[PDB]
Amino acid sequence: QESIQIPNNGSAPLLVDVRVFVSNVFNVDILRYTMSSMLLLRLSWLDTRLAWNTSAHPRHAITLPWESLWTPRLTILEALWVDWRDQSPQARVDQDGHVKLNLALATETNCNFELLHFPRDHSNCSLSFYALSNTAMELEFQAHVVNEIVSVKREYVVYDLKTQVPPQQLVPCFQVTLRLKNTALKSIIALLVPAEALLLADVCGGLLPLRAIERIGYKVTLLLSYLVLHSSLVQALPSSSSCNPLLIYYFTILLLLLFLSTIETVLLAGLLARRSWPETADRIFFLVYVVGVLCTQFVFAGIWMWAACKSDAAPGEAAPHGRR
Amino acid sequence: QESIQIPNNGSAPLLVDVRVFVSNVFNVDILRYTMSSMLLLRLSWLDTRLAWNTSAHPRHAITLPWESLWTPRLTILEALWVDWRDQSPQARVDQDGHVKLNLALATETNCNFELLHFPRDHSNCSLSFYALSNTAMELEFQAHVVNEIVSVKREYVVYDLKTQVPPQQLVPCFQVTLRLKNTALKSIIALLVPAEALLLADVCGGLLPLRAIERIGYKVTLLLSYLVLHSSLVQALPSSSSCNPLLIYYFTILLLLLFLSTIETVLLAGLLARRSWPETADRIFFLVYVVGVLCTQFVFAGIWMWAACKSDAAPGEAAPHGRR
Amino acid sequence: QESIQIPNNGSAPLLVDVRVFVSNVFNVDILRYTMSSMLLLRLSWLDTRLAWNTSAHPRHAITLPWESLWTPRLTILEALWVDWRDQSPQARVDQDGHVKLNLALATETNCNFELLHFPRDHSNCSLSFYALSNTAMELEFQAHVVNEIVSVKREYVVYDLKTQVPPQQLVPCFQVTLRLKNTALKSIIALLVPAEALLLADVCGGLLPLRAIERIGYKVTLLLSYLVLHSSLVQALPSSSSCNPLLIYYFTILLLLLFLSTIETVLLAGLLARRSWPETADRIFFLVYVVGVLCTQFVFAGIWMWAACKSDAAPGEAAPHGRR
Amino acid sequence: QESIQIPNNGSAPLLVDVRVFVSNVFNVDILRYTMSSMLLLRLSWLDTRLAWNTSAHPRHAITLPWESLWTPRLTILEALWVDWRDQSPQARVDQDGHVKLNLALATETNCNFELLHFPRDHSNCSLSFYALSNTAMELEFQAHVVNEIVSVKREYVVYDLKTQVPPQQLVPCFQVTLRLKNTALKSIIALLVPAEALLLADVCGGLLPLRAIERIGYKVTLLLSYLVLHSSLVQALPSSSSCNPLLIYYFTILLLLLFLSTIETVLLAGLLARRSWPETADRIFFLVYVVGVLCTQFVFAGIWMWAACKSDAAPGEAAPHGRR
Amino acid sequence: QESIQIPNNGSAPLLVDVRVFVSNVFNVDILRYTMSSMLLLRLSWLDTRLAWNTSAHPRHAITLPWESLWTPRLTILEALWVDWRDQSPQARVDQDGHVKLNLALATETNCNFELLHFPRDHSNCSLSFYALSNTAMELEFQAHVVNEIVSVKREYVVYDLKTQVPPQQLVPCFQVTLRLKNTALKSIIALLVPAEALLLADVCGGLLPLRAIERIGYKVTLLLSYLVLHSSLVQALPSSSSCNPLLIYYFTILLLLLFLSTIETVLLAGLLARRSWPETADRIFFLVYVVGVLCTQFVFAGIWMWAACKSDAAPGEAAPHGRR
Ligand SMILES: *[C@@H]1O[C@H](CO)[C@@H](O[C@@H]2O[C@H](CO)[C@@H](O)[C@H](O)[C@H]2NC(C)=O)[C@H](O)[C@H]1NC(C)=O
Ligand SMILES: *[C@@H]1O[C@H](CO)[C@@H](O[C@@H]2O[C@H](CO)[C@@H](O)[C@H](O)[C@H]2NC(C)=O)[C@H](O)[C@H]1NC(C)=O
Ligand SMILES: *[C@@H]1O[C@H](CO)[C@@H](O[C@@H]2O[C@H](CO)[C@@H](O)[C@H](O)[C@H]2NC(C)=O)[C@H](O)[C@H]1NC(C)=O
Ligand SMILES: *[C@@H]1O[C@H](CO)[C@@H](O[C@@H]2O[C@H](CO)[C@@H](O)[C@H](O)[C@H]2NC(C)=O)[C@H](O)[C@H]1NC(C)=O
Ligand SMILES: *[C@@H]1O[C@H](CO)[C@@H](O[C@@H]2O[C@H](CO)[C@@H](O)[C@H](O)[C@H]2NC(C)=O)[C@H](O)[C@H]1NC(C)=O
Ligand SMILES: *[C@@H]1O[C@H](CO)[C@@H](O)[C@H](O)[C@H]1NC(C)=O
Ligand SMILES: *[C@@H]1O[C@H](CO)[C@@H](O)[C@H](O)[C@H]1NC(C)=O
Ligand SMILES: *[C@@H]1O[C@H](CO)[C@@H](O)[C@H](O)[C@H]1NC(C)=O
Ligand SMILES: *[C@@H]1O[C@H](CO)[C@@H](O)[C@H](O)[C@H]1NC(C)=O
Ligand SMILES: *[C@@H]1O[C@H](CO)[C@@H](O)[C@H](O)[C@H]1NC(C)=O
């Protein structure tokens, strides 16, 4: 039973060098706030109890079941699920006692996406590997990350990868932090361009005379089209607790503007049916509406240029597990 | 085989201290009435049979397979599925016999959502860990919960967490109760604002004269838009057996109001085609319809302020498993 | 190897008492004809070989791995998948040899839904636990069901639960039969109310004069709305091989009625464009159409009150596995 | 280690009798070309090494772990995934050495659907169980199929089941072939009836005069409705590599016909706006369009009655695994 | 423990011959950039330690558990998940020491799809099997691929399969490269034909006079139809980081063209309402719009004929794992 026990480095804790290869980051689900990735962990340590004389055994390296010798069990706190692609990994031990273990795992880990500037948003995703069964006085970690992502043509691109060992911890752990940027043009072309086109179409349709019967139907059909587009957007974009994306607010403002234009058109047409004052009011409202649309565009551009989110840290983030 | 047996505390049952860390609550599916969460359970007890003299073994703590020594098997009744993120957990035993076991598990547990006040609804979710293979006279539980949720920017926010050991039980168990509040603005902006806008647009379109050919098409297009919106809402909101959400009733009432307005407009236009009495009837109905819309808004606001649901407890809730 | 063998009761087969607790019935998928449930099975039998003298062993009860002593392996024929929430269950054995085993399992079992009277339909769901590896002369079952469902606020409510041991069987098995009733108002409000409203709107729009240009557009927009609603319904309702739901036939009849009204309106308007006879024909058709709509409503109400389905039993139902 | 080895029948290979019970065929996904089924395999063979004298052991039958004695491992080539509903099956051995093993498995197997005549299409689904670890000179199979399907009220009904052992094979295998017929009326009512109704409505709307302003809007609204219906159909029907369903071609032809009618109406109305020749051309085109619609209906009916698909066999079908 | 060790070929590394049978390629998800396949790997090597004299053991071949003798553990870097359809594979060893192992596995592997020419696009999918626990000086691979795909009637057809052992590698691995071509007509008929039909309909509707009230509604309804179609396309097509499909750009250009036509029509109609110059401007714009539509068609055809994508290789592709 002593073989299964963690090797004793002496007064200092045992040092395990971890090399992390990020094979891919495939699913990035903003709706579920989850990021899916594939990792290869190479864990290397020294176990002098496993060292053998080369004269007795000619082999320079052997393979042993992971349940025979001591292997540090790693658990990811943020991972919704972990799938280890090896049922029973085999640890490779050199003649000097160096033990190297290779683990391939696909993990769906929780990531806090800052979706305020969607679609051009940047987020930080953290994968914290914890050795729950061990203590900091017994185990120490050196984590190195190697960028080996096999796919680059995706909506989200990882552009910064790093590893850190947080100080003042009781449970030994290492955190791999990556930065995700969204470069997908699907959302923009899908929603923003049709929305701007519909808004400009409504602005130009405001030129139609009040007495024309084709103006009301035109405006209402545009309103229905924008209602469909807004429904698609809101069903597509996730809703945060504190910092919702600016796009939903922008589309809500545009929807209210289109509704206001349609209601004004219908009300003034009805009043005129019962240059009269409805026509002058319609012209004044058209000028005011064009000015307001331009002002709304400029104000939202300024907001997008200078918006900030002071999202309060979650209890897990503010007070992480296994510290002090 | 005696090692696998539960330790004997004597006349009193063995005491196990359970510390629960809620890492995240990620999926909250109202349609399926399920809540998905990640938990870390630290179970600590005393096993004097495992105590060893420090002189014989210099190690101050050892790690053993969970199938070697006695580990209490915990089963969650409400959990649709449980995924233990460790294939074979390792129990850490101190020199004095104290055994500590760390279990990381992702569970999809049944939660009874009170959806009457959707979207601003509060619900209670309970996770009941049961030691089915043991009896109350043999095992006792002390459950402590620590709020370590890593994500706060989600639709549902946990704002109250507690643990309890129900009295007069035959199967030892402990229940973790959490409170879920919905702070998502996606539903409101998606549905309520377009619905109110369409209702006000129909009210203002009632101003159009009966003889106008543009009024019927306007009202029917608005009716189609609200039909699409109502279909989206009803396909989005789940249906409870007894207390359905107030939103579906509100949207049904608004849909009936819009249908009544359209049918009145069409009928009176047809009668007029065959100040005449259809025009006076149209004006009277317009006044009555505006008054009725305002009254419906006020009555539903009052209902929302003072609605209650005396939802009868389920047989599992009224008569919980393993009691007396 | 004799311990793993089934205990010998003598000439009579061994008797196993099974207590079934239905924790929840969560997914009821009519489209897939599957019902998902969670069950707790307490299996109790007598094994005199495991009995021990209390003088030798002070323990009054012990726990053993399920692979050490004989445990009856239960297989569900109708279950699409079974998930046993315990990797290795532990059997509790008393000093007298009584063995009790607790198994928690989540099962997706096939259920034959009688969807003729959707949404107010009642169905029978059967879960047949079979001991395939054993014979009837060796194993006997006593099955008891306890209603411990934890959620009652769902679309489908279980209102009758029972257990039975079919006679003249070769493979020992026990069947848990439950009755599912649908109390969801989502389908009704979603589909029936808009359908009736659109039908009545078309009936009232038949009042519009033939020469009016607003009648054709009104009827066609209503037709498009009902086409969308009918598409939503047919994509929502499953299609049985023999007894399809009455709702799809009702909506098809209403869709044909609306198409007939629109085609008549367009044809007579075109003929009139080229009191004339088209107007008299339009009035006669309007009267006939109102009468036909009322007659269709009454006839379908009578059919719903007196419809029956003599659905032929499936080969598995007519000839169940392991009989004679 | 000799117990695990396959029993020696002598010069002839060992004979294993396989009885297959098809409990259900639940998912039949045309889009993924996969069919999901549940099977119970009873494998019986003779192992004289396991025979015991009744005098020494009074038991007439024993149960052994499947990893103790030789059990043929069966692999399905077409199965996307297999789920064995028993973690560790137990083999029942009689006193004479007869070994019977019961395996319950849910499999998602690839099936080549002939979707040319959708929805009234017939397909052949094959499940090939292979003993990869064994050779034909060592193992032989006798496969019998019993129709025990528990659900008959589904879209696809199995009406023919058979088993075969292909000749001239090196890897012992047996193939269960079943015939699937689609009896679902959901697709027909959902798509064909609305399509025919819209086509006839457009034909009747061709009666409207060219100078009428209501004709263009009518035709365009019908065109939009048929566009929505065609989009729903094409997103519903899968696309084969060589033999696509006739329904998509039929709906494409109808969509082109409706577009041609709308374009002709708009062009001639515009030319007339600038009995004149546009009116005579419109009447001639109306007659030609009615004749063409009738001819298209008759030609497609004849094609449906006499269409054939000589789909080239896949490399796996033409050259099956483990032959010669 | 020496049996589990890799056999020693001497100075040269041990040679393992791998035969790969591709049973099927079923899911090809462009949105997730993943390809799902089923493979059968036959791994053959020589282990003289397992050779036995035929005089002692009459058997010419034996079967052993994969955990008894040395079996090379293969890991796929690009595979999102791997499902080995055998819980415990059995290795067949001949009398001369030749060991053959058959592994059936269903894998979802990452594939970089070149979607620039969608739907008629060709892509390369690579499956890299790595022996992480071994070194190149100890293990060598010979990989052979056999095309045994059981389904050919799918959207994506594999038309080229090959195997390669990359040179200058430290971790022994072999790569199976296949070529995927899309032959599905679902996308074309679904989107391109309706888009071209709507564009030509708008072009022909430009013939309508400016003063006509039916022109604006016609153009706006066509615009709404194309908006729905464009939304369906963009929600259907995935978005790459660098080389988006040409279809989304084409549909965006067509949508902008339709919006420009509608805005011009509405603006000039409004100006005319307030041969006049609006009519001459409308005719000139109609000619310019027809010319521009034809020019856009020709330019996009030329682009499609001569477009190229120099997609930069991903860090995993440029620097593959286990080299030098
Ligand atoms: C045992 O503890 C010592 C001290 O922490 C470790 O030695 C350190 O190793 C790292 C990198 O390998 C160096 O950066 C430090 O400078 C070293 N410190 C000293 C005092 O030497 C040693 O690696 C540990 N050995 C094992 C097997 O864990
Ligand atoms: C054995 O039983 C005793 C009595 O229940 C336990 O002692 C109690 O422990 C809790 C907290 O540890 C205290 O709140 C009580 O005051 C204690 N009661 C008494 C009489 O001392 C004891 O913890 C149990 N020991 C084990 C190993 O389970
Ligand atoms: C052995 O067989 C006998 C006879 O079937 C079983 O005794 C019956 O038990 C049930 C309920 O426990 C009673 O309803 C019957 O009246 C009993 N019949 C007789 C003749 O006693 C007995 O339970 C079986 N014992 C075991 C361990 O299986
Ligand atoms: C051993 O081989 C013989 C010959 O194939 C098998 O005997 C045959 O069994 C089948 C059905 O059981 C009969 O249809 C044949 O007529 C039999 N042939 C002969 C020559 O007898 C025998 O079943 C095999 N025994 C075992 C244990 O596999
Ligand atoms: C041991 O190493 C030798 C040399 O690599 C292997 O022999 C080669 O085998 C391949 C195909 O089997 C031939 O193409 C080469 O020509 C052979 N080279 C020589 C020098 O013979 C041999 O296969 C290896 N043996 C084992 C068990 O791995
Ligand atoms: C992400 O982490 C880095 C520190 O490594 C920090 O500078 C940056 O502000 C973070 N970005 C976001 C969007 O949180
Ligand atoms: C939830 O539980 C608390 C008791 O802890 C209770 O006071 C409260 O009424 C419950 N809330 C709901 C919505 O049931
Ligand atoms: C369900 O089973 C009961 C018998 O327990 C039977 O009386 C009833 O007719 C069945 N109901 C249906 C809808 O099949
Ligand atoms: C299916 O298999 C049978 C032979 O058993 C064959 O006669 C028939 O033509 C096949 N049907 C189809 C649609 O391939
Ligand atoms: C795919 O791989 C082959 C080499 O085998 C190469 O010639 C070809 O250009 C590649 N095709 C694509 C689309 O990358």
Side-chain angles (χ1 to χ4, degrees), chain A residues 16 18 41 43 71-77 82 84 101 103 105 128-133 139 141 172-174, chain B residues 85-86:
Chain A
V16 163
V18 181
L41 318 172
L43 275 69
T71 52
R73 270 83 176 160
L74 309 164
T75 307
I76 318 176
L77 305 189
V82 298
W84 309 86
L101 182 68
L103 309 171
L105 74 166
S128 300
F129 296 78
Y130 274 75
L132 298 183
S133 53
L139 192 62
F141 274 133
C173 79
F174 64 95
Chain B
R85 317 215 292 265
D86 282 319

Side-chain angles (χ1 to χ4, degrees), chain D residues 80-153:
Chain D
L80 273 68
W81 52 264
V82 298
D83 189 11
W84 309 86
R85 317 215 292 265
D86 282 319
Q87 288 177 340
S88 61
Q90 277 187 325
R92 164 183 208 81
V93 183
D94 294 332
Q95 68 207 18
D96 280 343
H98 294 87
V99 191
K100 297 167 185 148
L101 182 68
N102 296 286
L103 309 171
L105 74 166
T107 62
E108 175 162 29
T109 60
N110 189 2
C111 183
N112 296 328
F113 298 117
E114 181 170 355
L115 306 154
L116 177 76
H117 279 153
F118 189 90
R120 300 282 89 84
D121 57 345
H122 294 235
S123 303
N124 273 325
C125 298
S126 289
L127 287 88
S128 300
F129 296 78
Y130 274 75
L132 298 183
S133 53
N134 286 103
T135 71
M137 290 177 71
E138 286 172 5
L139 192 62
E140 201 178 355
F141 274 133
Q142 292 182 178
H144 296 285
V145 64
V146 180
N147 191 10
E148 290 200 337
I149 300 171
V150 72
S151 178
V152 67
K153 36 171 69 174

Side-chain angles (χ1 to χ4, degrees), chain B residues 275-286:
Chain B
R275 292 177 184 170
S276 295
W277 79 265
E279 295 179 354
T280 309
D282 171 45
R283 293 185 64 180
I284 291 167
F285 182 91
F286 161 73

Side-chain angles (χ1 to χ4, degrees), chain E residues 258-275:
Chain E
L258 263 72
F259 263 104
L260 176 69
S261 162
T262 305
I263 296 169
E264 168 268 344
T265 290
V266 172
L267 279 170
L268 291 176
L271 289 175
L272 172 65
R274 264 79 177 275
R275 292 177 184 170

Side-chain angles (χ1 to χ4, degrees), chain A residues 5-6 32 76 110 138 316, chain B residues 59 63 85 92 149 154:
Chain A
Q5 309 311 315
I6 178 169
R32 296 178 62 187
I76 318 176
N110 189 2
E138 286 172 5
Chain B
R59 304 209 170 246
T63 56
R85 317 215 292 265
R92 164 183 208 81
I149 300 171
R154 285 178 189 252

